[PDB]
Amino acid sequence: MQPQPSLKGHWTTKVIEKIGTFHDATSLYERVKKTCKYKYYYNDQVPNHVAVMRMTTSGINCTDACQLFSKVLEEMGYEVKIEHVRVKCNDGKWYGHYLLRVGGFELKDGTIWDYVSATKTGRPLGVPCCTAGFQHLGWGIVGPVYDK
């Protein structure tokens, strides 16, 4: 038959255990959309095992969600890239933001996979959490500062 996403990976398994079965990035998005929550806490991160525990209870932010779900989607076999962007919402403000770029299998290349659309602003797969305006800023999470 034709190749399908692998459900064997470490982080995939711990996500399946917490939110229900999925078979690909689209169904993943829908189970997330159904189980998980957005919690804002500045730029702070937690370990992935902490994010897995919090994401349906107290919630996680776009930074942690991108950290965990990019691991899940790469285990599944997708091409993944966390993108740092700024979105303009219907309130007129710009917001700094992380989303995932995912392609392969049933997803076209560069498809937006946006945790915050899924859980907070209710926009469908492929659509960032706000659509009034967009600016690419770069690829990856900004690291910590070093000085002294």
Curated annotation (Swiss-Prot):
Signal peptide: none annotated. Its EC number is 3.4.22.-. It is an enzyme of class 3 (hydrolase). Its cofactor is Ca(2+); Mg(2+). Need a divalent cation like Activated by Ca(2+)>Mn(2+)>Mg(2+). GO terms for biological process: defense response to bacterium; killing of cells of another organism; proteolysis. Cysteine protease that cleaves the cell wall of its host methanogen under hydrogen limitation of the latter (autolysis). Cleaves the epsilon-Ala-Lys isopeptide bond in the oligopeptides of pseudomurein. This is Pseudomurein endoisopeptidase PeiW. It comes from Methanothermobacter phage psiM100. The gene is peiW. The chain holds residues 138 to 284 of 284 of the full protein.
